[PDB]
Coordinates of C-alpha atoms and ligand atoms in Angstrom, one line a residue:
Chain A
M152 CA 14.8 138.2 -57.0
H153 CA 17.9 138.0 -54.7
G154 CA 18.0 140.2 -51.5
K155 CA 20.5 143.0 -51.7
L156 CA 23.0 144.0 -48.9
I157 CA 22.5 147.7 -48.0
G158 CA 25.2 149.5 -45.9
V159 CA 23.2 152.1 -44.0
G160 CA 24.9 155.0 -42.3
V161 CA 23.0 155.8 -39.2
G162 CA 24.7 159.0 -38.2
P163 CA 26.6 159.9 -35.0
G164 CA 23.9 159.2 -32.3
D165 CA 21.0 161.6 -32.5
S166 CA 18.1 160.0 -34.4
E167 CA 17.4 163.4 -36.0
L168 CA 20.8 163.0 -37.8
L169 CA 19.6 160.1 -39.8
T170 CA 18.8 160.8 -43.4
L171 CA 15.3 160.5 -44.8
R172 CA 16.6 157.7 -47.0
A173 CA 18.1 155.8 -44.1
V174 CA 14.8 156.1 -42.1
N175 CA 13.0 154.8 -45.2
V176 CA 15.2 151.7 -45.7
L177 CA 15.1 150.9 -42.0
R178 CA 11.3 151.1 -41.8
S179 CA 11.0 148.8 -44.8
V180 CA 13.8 146.1 -44.9
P181 CA 12.9 142.6 -43.5
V182 CA 16.4 142.0 -42.0
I183 CA 18.9 144.2 -40.1
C184 CA 22.5 143.3 -39.5
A185 CA 24.0 144.9 -36.5
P186 CA 27.3 143.2 -35.4
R187 CA 28.3 143.4 -31.7
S188 CA 31.1 142.4 -29.4
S189 CA 30.5 139.4 -27.0
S190 CA 29.7 141.4 -23.8
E191 CA 27.5 143.9 -25.7
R192 CA 23.7 143.3 -25.5
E193 CA 23.5 145.6 -28.6
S194 CA 25.8 147.7 -30.7
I195 CA 25.5 151.5 -30.6
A196 CA 24.2 151.5 -34.2
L197 CA 21.2 149.3 -33.2
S198 CA 20.4 151.5 -30.2
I199 CA 20.4 154.6 -32.5
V200 CA 17.6 153.0 -34.6
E201 CA 15.7 151.5 -31.7
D202 CA 12.7 153.8 -31.8
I203 CA 12.3 153.4 -35.6
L204 CA 12.4 149.6 -35.3
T205 CA 9.9 149.5 -32.4
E206 CA 7.6 152.0 -34.2
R207 CA 7.2 149.4 -37.0
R208 CA 3.9 147.6 -37.2
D209 CA 5.7 144.9 -39.2
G210 CA 8.4 142.7 -37.7
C211 CA 12.1 143.0 -38.5
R212 CA 14.6 140.2 -38.1
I213 CA 17.8 141.2 -36.4
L214 CA 21.1 139.6 -37.2
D215 CA 23.7 140.3 -34.5
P216 CA 26.9 138.3 -35.3
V217 CA 29.3 138.4 -32.4
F218 CA 32.8 139.8 -32.7
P219 CA 35.0 139.1 -29.6
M220 CA 37.3 142.0 -28.8
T221 CA 40.0 139.4 -28.3
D222 CA 40.0 138.0 -31.9
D223 CA 43.4 137.6 -33.5
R224 CA 43.6 138.3 -37.3
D225 CA 42.6 134.6 -38.2
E226 CA 39.6 134.4 -35.8
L227 CA 38.4 137.8 -36.9
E228 CA 38.6 136.7 -40.5
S229 CA 36.7 133.5 -39.6
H230 CA 34.0 135.5 -37.8
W231 CA 33.5 137.7 -40.9
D232 CA 33.1 134.5 -42.9
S233 CA 30.2 133.3 -40.7
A234 CA 28.6 136.8 -40.6
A235 CA 28.5 136.7 -44.4
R236 CA 27.0 133.2 -44.3
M237 CA 24.1 134.4 -42.1
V238 CA 23.6 137.5 -44.2
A239 CA 23.8 135.5 -47.6
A240 CA 21.1 133.1 -46.2
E241 CA 18.7 136.0 -46.0
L242 CA 19.6 137.3 -49.5
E243 CA 19.2 133.7 -50.9
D244 CA 15.7 133.8 -49.7
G245 CA 14.9 137.1 -51.4
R246 CA 15.2 139.3 -48.3
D247 CA 17.2 142.6 -48.3
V248 CA 19.5 143.1 -45.4
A249 CA 20.5 146.5 -44.0
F250 CA 23.9 146.5 -42.4
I251 CA 23.7 149.5 -40.0
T252 CA 26.8 151.6 -39.4
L253 CA 27.5 154.3 -36.9
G254 CA 27.9 157.6 -38.9
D255 CA 28.7 156.9 -42.5
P256 CA 29.4 153.4 -44.1
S257 CA 32.5 154.5 -46.0
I258 CA 34.5 155.9 -43.0
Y259 CA 36.0 153.0 -40.8
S260 CA 32.7 151.2 -40.7
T261 CA 33.7 147.5 -41.2
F262 CA 31.2 147.4 -44.1
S263 CA 33.8 146.4 -46.7
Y264 CA 34.7 143.2 -44.8
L265 CA 31.1 142.0 -45.2
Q266 CA 30.7 143.7 -48.5
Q267 CA 33.7 142.0 -50.2
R268 CA 32.5 138.6 -49.0
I269 CA 28.9 139.1 -50.1
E270 CA 29.8 140.4 -53.6
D271 CA 32.3 137.4 -54.0
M272 CA 29.3 135.1 -53.3
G273 CA 27.6 136.8 -56.3
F274 CA 25.2 139.1 -54.5
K275 CA 24.5 142.8 -55.1
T276 CA 25.4 145.6 -52.7
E277 CA 24.3 149.2 -52.0
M278 CA 25.2 152.0 -49.6
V279 CA 23.3 154.8 -48.0
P280 CA 25.6 157.6 -46.8
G281 CA 25.3 159.3 -43.4
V282 CA 26.5 162.2 -41.3
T283 CA 30.0 161.2 -40.4
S284 CA 31.1 161.7 -36.8
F285 CA 33.8 164.2 -37.7
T286 CA 31.6 166.7 -39.4
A287 CA 29.0 166.3 -36.7
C288 CA 31.8 167.1 -34.1
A289 CA 32.8 170.2 -36.1
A290 CA 29.2 171.3 -36.1
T291 CA 28.7 170.9 -32.3
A292 CA 32.0 172.8 -31.7
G293 CA 30.8 175.6 -34.0
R294 CA 33.8 175.1 -36.2
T295 CA 34.5 174.7 -39.9
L296 CA 37.1 172.0 -40.9
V297 CA 38.6 173.2 -44.2
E298 CA 38.0 176.0 -46.7
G299 CA 39.4 177.1 -50.0
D300 CA 42.6 175.4 -50.8
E301 CA 43.2 173.7 -47.5
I302 CA 44.1 170.0 -47.2
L303 CA 42.1 167.7 -44.8
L304 CA 43.7 164.6 -43.2
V305 CA 41.8 161.9 -41.5
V306 CA 43.7 159.4 -39.3
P307 CA 42.6 156.5 -37.0
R308 CA 46.0 156.4 -35.2
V309 CA 49.1 158.4 -34.5
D310 CA 51.8 156.9 -36.7
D311 CA 55.0 157.9 -38.5
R312 CA 53.1 158.6 -41.7
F313 CA 50.9 161.0 -39.6
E314 CA 54.1 162.8 -38.3
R315 CA 55.8 163.2 -41.7
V316 CA 52.6 164.3 -43.5
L317 CA 51.3 166.8 -41.0
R318 CA 53.1 169.9 -42.2
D319 CA 51.6 169.5 -45.7
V320 CA 48.0 169.6 -44.3
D321 CA 45.9 172.4 -42.9
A322 CA 43.4 170.4 -40.8
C323 CA 43.3 166.9 -39.4
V324 CA 40.8 164.6 -37.8
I325 CA 42.0 162.1 -35.3
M326 CA 39.7 159.1 -34.7
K327 CA 39.7 156.8 -31.6
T328 CA 41.2 159.8 -29.7
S329 CA 40.8 158.2 -26.2
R330 CA 43.6 155.8 -27.2
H331 CA 45.4 158.5 -29.2
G332 CA 45.2 162.0 -27.6
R333 CA 48.5 161.9 -25.7
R334 CA 50.7 160.9 -28.8
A335 CA 48.5 163.2 -30.9
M336 CA 49.1 166.2 -28.6
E337 CA 52.8 165.7 -28.8
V338 CA 53.0 165.5 -32.6
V339 CA 50.6 168.4 -33.4
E340 CA 52.0 170.7 -30.8
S341 CA 55.6 170.2 -32.2
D342 CA 54.3 171.8 -35.4
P343 CA 55.5 175.5 -35.4
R344 CA 52.1 176.8 -36.8
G345 CA 49.3 178.2 -34.7
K346 CA 46.7 175.4 -34.1
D347 CA 43.1 175.3 -32.8
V348 CA 42.4 172.0 -31.2
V349 CA 39.1 170.6 -29.9
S350 CA 37.9 167.1 -28.8
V351 CA 34.3 165.8 -28.9
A352 CA 32.9 162.7 -27.2
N353 CA 29.4 161.3 -27.7
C354 CA 28.6 163.9 -30.3
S355 CA 24.9 164.5 -30.7
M356 CA 24.0 162.3 -27.8
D357 CA 22.7 163.3 -24.3
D358 CA 26.1 162.9 -22.7
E359 CA 28.1 164.8 -25.4
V360 CA 31.3 166.5 -24.1
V361 CA 33.2 169.3 -25.9
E362 CA 36.6 170.0 -24.6
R363 CA 39.6 172.1 -25.7
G364 CA 42.7 170.1 -26.5
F365 CA 43.3 166.5 -27.1
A366 CA 40.9 164.8 -24.6
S367 CA 37.2 164.3 -23.9
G368 CA 35.8 161.7 -21.4
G369 CA 37.9 158.7 -22.4
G370 CA 35.0 156.7 -24.1
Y371 CA 35.3 154.9 -27.4
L372 CA 33.3 157.7 -29.3
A373 CA 35.8 160.6 -29.2
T374 CA 37.2 162.5 -32.0
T375 CA 39.8 165.3 -32.1
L376 CA 39.8 168.2 -34.6
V377 CA 42.9 170.1 -35.5
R378 CA 43.0 173.3 -37.6
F379 CA 46.3 175.1 -38.4
Chain B
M1308 CA 15.6 188.0 -28.7
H1309 CA 18.0 188.7 -31.6
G1310 CA 17.8 185.8 -34.1
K1311 CA 20.6 183.3 -34.5
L1312 CA 22.5 182.2 -37.7
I1313 CA 22.2 178.5 -38.5
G1314 CA 24.5 176.9 -41.0
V1315 CA 22.5 174.0 -42.5
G1316 CA 24.0 171.2 -44.5
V1317 CA 21.6 170.0 -47.2
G1318 CA 23.5 167.1 -48.6
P1319 CA 24.8 166.4 -52.1
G1320 CA 21.5 166.8 -54.2
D1321 CA 18.9 164.2 -53.2
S1322 CA 16.3 165.7 -50.9
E1323 CA 16.2 162.3 -49.2
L1324 CA 19.8 162.8 -48.1
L1325 CA 18.7 165.7 -45.8
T1326 CA 18.8 164.9 -42.1
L1327 CA 15.5 165.0 -40.1
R1328 CA 17.1 167.9 -38.2
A1329 CA 17.8 170.0 -41.3
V1330 CA 14.2 169.4 -42.4
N1331 CA 13.0 170.6 -39.0
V1332 CA 15.1 173.8 -39.2
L1333 CA 14.1 174.4 -42.8
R1334 CA 10.4 174.0 -42.0
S1335 CA 10.4 176.5 -39.1
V1336 CA 13.0 179.3 -39.8
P1337 CA 11.5 182.6 -40.9
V1338 CA 14.5 183.4 -43.2
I1339 CA 16.7 181.3 -45.5
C1340 CA 20.0 182.7 -46.8
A1341 CA 20.9 181.2 -50.2
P1342 CA 23.7 183.1 -52.0
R1343 CA 24.0 182.7 -55.8
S1344 CA 25.6 184.0 -58.9
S1345 CA 23.6 186.2 -61.3
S1346 CA 23.6 183.4 -63.9
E1347 CA 21.4 181.3 -61.6
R1348 CA 17.8 181.8 -60.6
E1349 CA 18.6 179.8 -57.4
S1350 CA 21.7 178.2 -56.0
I1351 CA 22.0 174.4 -56.0
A1352 CA 21.5 174.4 -52.2
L1353 CA 18.1 176.2 -52.6
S1354 CA 16.9 173.9 -55.4
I1355 CA 17.6 170.9 -53.1
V1356 CA 15.4 172.4 -50.5
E1357 CA 12.7 174.1 -52.6
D1358 CA 10.0 171.4 -52.1
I1359 CA 10.3 171.6 -48.3
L1360 CA 10.0 175.4 -48.6
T1361 CA 7.0 175.4 -51.0
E1362 CA 5.2 172.8 -48.8
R1363 CA 5.5 175.0 -45.7
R1364 CA 2.1 176.4 -44.5
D1365 CA 4.0 179.3 -42.7
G1366 CA 5.8 181.4 -45.2
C1367 CA 9.6 181.9 -45.6
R1368 CA 11.7 184.9 -46.6
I1369 CA 14.6 184.2 -48.9
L1370 CA 17.8 186.2 -48.9
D1371 CA 19.7 185.4 -52.1
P1372 CA 22.6 187.9 -52.4
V1373 CA 24.4 187.8 -55.8
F1374 CA 28.2 187.2 -55.6
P1375 CA 30.5 187.8 -58.6
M1376 CA 31.5 184.6 -60.3
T1377 CA 35.1 184.6 -59.2
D1378 CA 37.1 182.2 -57.0
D1379 CA 40.0 184.5 -57.2
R1380 CA 39.9 188.1 -56.2
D1381 CA 39.3 189.1 -52.6
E1382 CA 36.5 191.0 -54.4
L1383 CA 34.6 188.3 -52.5
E1384 CA 35.3 189.7 -49.1
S1385 CA 33.6 193.0 -49.6
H1386 CA 30.6 191.0 -50.9
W1387 CA 30.6 188.9 -47.7
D1388 CA 30.7 192.1 -45.6
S1389 CA 27.5 193.3 -47.4
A1390 CA 25.8 189.9 -47.1
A1391 CA 26.6 189.8 -43.4
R1392 CA 24.9 193.2 -43.0
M1393 CA 21.9 191.8 -44.8
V1394 CA 21.8 188.8 -42.6
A1395 CA 22.3 190.9 -39.4
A1396 CA 19.4 193.1 -40.3
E1397 CA 17.2 189.9 -40.1
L1398 CA 18.8 188.7 -36.9
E1399 CA 18.4 192.2 -35.2
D1400 CA 14.7 192.0 -35.8
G1401 CA 14.6 188.7 -33.9
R1402 CA 14.5 186.4 -37.0
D1403 CA 16.5 183.2 -37.2
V1404 CA 18.3 182.8 -40.6
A1405 CA 19.3 179.4 -42.0
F1406 CA 22.3 179.6 -44.3
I1407 CA 21.9 176.5 -46.5
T1408 CA 25.0 174.9 -47.8
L1409 CA 25.5 172.0 -50.2
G1410 CA 26.7 168.8 -48.5
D1411 CA 28.0 169.6 -45.0
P1412 CA 28.7 173.2 -43.7
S1413 CA 32.2 172.3 -42.3
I1414 CA 33.7 171.0 -45.5
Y1415 CA 34.8 173.6 -48.1
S1416 CA 31.6 175.5 -47.5
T1417 CA 31.1 179.2 -47.7
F1418 CA 29.5 179.3 -44.3
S1419 CA 32.7 180.2 -42.4
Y1420 CA 33.0 183.7 -44.2
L1421 CA 29.5 184.6 -43.1
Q1422 CA 29.8 182.9 -39.7
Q1423 CA 33.0 184.9 -38.6
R1424 CA 31.4 188.2 -39.6
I1425 CA 28.1 187.5 -37.9
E1426 CA 29.9 186.3 -34.7
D1427 CA 32.0 189.5 -34.9
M1428 CA 28.9 191.6 -35.0
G1429 CA 27.7 189.9 -31.7
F1430 CA 25.2 187.3 -32.9
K1431 CA 24.9 183.6 -32.0
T1432 CA 25.7 181.0 -34.6
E1433 CA 24.9 177.2 -34.9
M1434 CA 25.6 174.3 -37.4
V1435 CA 23.5 171.4 -38.6
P1436 CA 25.8 168.7 -40.1
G1437 CA 25.0 167.1 -43.4
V1438 CA 25.9 164.3 -45.7
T1439 CA 29.1 165.5 -47.3
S1440 CA 29.6 164.9 -51.1
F1441 CA 32.7 162.7 -50.9
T1442 CA 31.0 159.9 -48.8
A1443 CA 27.9 160.2 -50.9
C1444 CA 30.2 159.7 -53.9
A1445 CA 31.7 156.6 -52.3
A1446 CA 28.2 155.3 -51.5
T1447 CA 26.9 155.6 -55.1
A1448 CA 30.1 154.0 -56.3
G1449 CA 29.5 151.2 -53.9
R1450 CA 33.0 151.7 -52.4
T1451 CA 34.1 152.3 -48.9
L1452 CA 36.9 154.9 -48.3
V1453 CA 39.0 153.7 -45.4
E1454 CA 39.0 150.8 -42.9
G1455 CA 41.4 149.8 -40.1
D1456 CA 44.6 151.9 -39.9
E1457 CA 44.2 153.5 -43.3
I1458 CA 44.6 157.2 -43.7
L1459 CA 42.3 159.5 -45.7
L1460 CA 43.5 162.6 -47.6
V1461 CA 41.0 165.1 -48.9
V1462 CA 42.3 167.6 -51.4
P1463 CA 40.6 170.6 -53.1
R1464 CA 43.2 170.7 -55.9
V1465 CA 46.4 168.8 -56.8
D1466 CA 49.6 170.6 -55.9
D1467 CA 53.2 169.7 -54.7
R1468 CA 51.9 168.7 -51.3
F1469 CA 49.6 166.0 -52.8
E1470 CA 52.6 164.5 -54.5
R1471 CA 54.9 164.4 -51.5
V1472 CA 52.1 163.1 -49.2
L1473 CA 50.6 160.4 -51.4
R1474 CA 52.7 157.4 -50.5
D1475 CA 51.8 158.0 -46.8
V1476 CA 48.0 157.8 -47.3
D1477 CA 45.8 154.9 -48.3
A1478 CA 42.9 156.8 -49.9
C1479 CA 42.3 160.2 -51.4
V1480 CA 39.4 162.4 -52.3
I1481 CA 40.0 164.9 -55.1
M1482 CA 37.4 167.7 -55.2
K1483 CA 36.8 170.0 -58.2
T1484 CA 37.9 167.0 -60.1
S1485 CA 37.0 168.0 -63.7
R1486 CA 40.0 170.4 -63.7
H1487 CA 42.7 168.7 -61.5
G1488 CA 42.5 165.0 -62.6
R1489 CA 45.3 165.5 -65.2
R1490 CA 48.2 166.1 -62.8
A1491 CA 46.3 163.9 -60.3
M1492 CA 46.3 161.0 -62.8
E1493 CA 50.1 161.1 -63.4
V1494 CA 50.9 161.2 -59.7
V1495 CA 48.5 158.4 -58.9
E1496 CA 49.7 156.2 -61.8
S1497 CA 53.3 156.5 -60.8
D1498 CA 52.5 155.1 -57.3
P1499 CA 53.8 151.5 -57.2
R1500 CA 50.8 150.2 -55.3
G1501 CA 47.7 148.5 -56.7
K1502 CA 44.9 151.0 -56.8
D1503 CA 41.3 151.6 -57.9
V1504 CA 39.8 154.9 -59.0
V1505 CA 36.3 156.1 -59.6
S1506 CA 34.9 159.5 -60.6
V1507 CA 31.4 160.6 -59.7
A1508 CA 29.6 163.6 -61.2
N1509 CA 26.3 165.0 -59.9
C1510 CA 26.2 162.3 -57.1
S1511 CA 22.6 161.6 -56.0
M1512 CA 21.1 163.8 -58.7
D1513 CA 19.0 162.7 -61.7
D1514 CA 22.0 163.2 -64.0
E1515 CA 24.5 161.4 -61.7
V1516 CA 27.3 159.8 -63.7
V1517 CA 29.7 157.2 -62.2
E1518 CA 32.8 155.9 -64.0
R1519 CA 35.9 153.8 -63.2
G1520 CA 39.3 155.6 -63.4
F1521 CA 39.8 159.3 -63.9
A1522 CA 36.7 160.3 -65.9
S1523 CA 37.6 163.5 -67.7
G1524 CA 34.9 166.2 -67.7
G1525 CA 32.1 165.9 -65.3
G1526 CA 31.3 169.6 -64.8
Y1527 CA 31.5 171.5 -61.5
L1528 CA 30.1 168.8 -59.2
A1529 CA 32.6 166.1 -59.8
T1530 CA 34.8 164.2 -57.4
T1531 CA 37.5 161.5 -57.9
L1532 CA 38.1 158.8 -55.3
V1533 CA 41.4 156.9 -55.1
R1534 CA 42.0 153.9 -52.9
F1535 CA 45.4 152.2 -52.7
Ligands
LIG2540 N1 29.0 160.2 -31.7 C1 30.3 160.3 -31.8 N2 31.0 161.3 -31.2 C2 32.4 161.5 -31.3 N3 33.1 160.6 -32.1 C3 32.4 159.6 -32.7 C4 31.0 159.4 -32.6 N4 30.7 158.4 -33.3 C5 31.7 157.8 -33.9 N5 32.9 158.6 -33.5 C6 34.2 158.3 -34.0 O1 34.3 157.2 -34.9 C7 35.2 156.2 -34.4 C8 34.7 154.8 -34.6 S1 35.1 154.3 -36.3 C9 33.5 154.5 -37.1 C10 33.3 155.9 -37.8 C11 31.9 156.1 -38.3 N6 31.6 155.2 -39.5 C12 31.7 157.6 -38.7 O2 31.4 157.8 -39.9 O3 31.8 158.5 -37.9 C13 35.3 156.5 -32.9 O4 36.5 156.1 -32.4 C14 35.2 158.0 -32.9 O5 36.4 158.6 -33.4
LIG2541 N1 26.6 166.2 -55.9 C1 27.9 166.2 -56.0 N2 28.5 165.2 -56.8 C2 29.9 165.2 -57.0 N3 30.7 166.1 -56.3 C3 30.1 167.0 -55.5 C4 28.7 167.1 -55.4 N4 28.4 168.1 -54.5 C5 29.6 168.7 -54.2 N5 30.6 168.0 -54.8 C6 32.1 168.3 -54.6 O1 32.2 169.5 -53.8 C7 32.9 170.5 -54.6 C8 32.4 171.8 -54.1 S1 33.1 172.2 -52.5 C9 31.5 172.1 -51.6 C10 31.5 170.9 -50.6 C11 30.3 170.7 -49.8 N6 30.2 171.6 -48.6 C12 30.2 169.2 -49.3 O2 30.3 168.9 -48.1 O3 30.2 168.3 -50.1 C13 32.8 170.1 -56.0 O4 33.9 170.6 -56.8 C14 32.8 168.6 -55.9 O5 34.1 168.0 -55.9

């Protein structure tokens, strides 16, 4: 009888990159959870599912717990606490909640922060996978990531681990690349092997930018793909 | 006027894990390329997609070239040369061909072997991203893969590189897992960190099996997920 928490991957931007399953959950759940920063009117995940939500003859309740960009670790933790409290109030009343996530819910989505709390409160949890941004970026660039015996590495940051590991991998995905392109260029280009590098911003959206090398547009939604 | 080649990710098994975009392509292309071994009536990719194809009003031609069951010998390359000729003959006649691929076409897919040849012969090529099997596995397991500054490693087999790189990553995907889990287990167990492990066979299919730790013999479509 409890509501369940469902982590729903929404894909990289284009509504046509939602899965049939995602579309089905989102057309049916009574509650959607789409967290946002303080100066956002709506998260990017909510704007992706806008048309679906407004197509609905039935009403959907939107939970949009606020996450200030300025939170220190303790305030962030406390803001996840109250997010879980508003979500659990829905599940306590028998209503399923779909937590929408850009791309796929298993890849840097923040889903686990809510998920751990909700399962600790004794509720049940599910996940719907999606097109992750990095395979969508490979697709738009007309490029394959890995084949045969090649190793893929996915990083959110340029760090010392990244540097010492790089020679033992054949391809790598660099997330948040508007913050990370410069450091990334330096590390990858010091590698003696031939490399093919491309960066993609706003993949699958109207303002998508494909650029050779370690930069594209400077917005939050940029990813770099490296193949050796 | 010449047709174009489109690499279409079909997801891990469940037809509901298709994107709307893949559906759209699959409903309208005149030709589908779905290579197979002789021991199969249809590839796994074609069986995922069969109900879309049967339900079309407008008929579809299937190219299903047989490849020798071998991972090993560049006996495969002469077979790709002949399949590319087969595909090019459709493109030359102004017919689009969708090459369907399990999961996503950028991730250990066979698409790149056909793509390079078709592009070398002077035809246009496109990709439609899909739900990749490793994130679909994480979703069925109810586990997220990476958050925050965690680093993800995806490996097709477990060799010396895996061992040397492990302590520098926070999560790893082991593909073809029914064969590699033995050496994988030992490496993972000897890591000093707390860890959880889950193995998923036939993710999203009727006969999906999920079990904690290194499950030992899940057949071809089996993946192991490790988080530290
Ligand atoms: N549409 C898009 N185009 C390019 N990169 C994108 C993108 N959407 C998300 N990203 C990438 O994802 C990062 C946010 S972390 C969220 C990742 C998401 N769960 C996924 O599966 O893709 C961004 O910094 C960027 O690296
Ligand atoms: N339905 C499924 N369940 C579990 N693993 C799967 C799977 N489908 C594919 N795989 C994984 O993929 C490997 C074949 S490599 C093909 C990968 C595919 N392009 C994708 O994106 O997922 C298998 O050895 C297995 O590790």
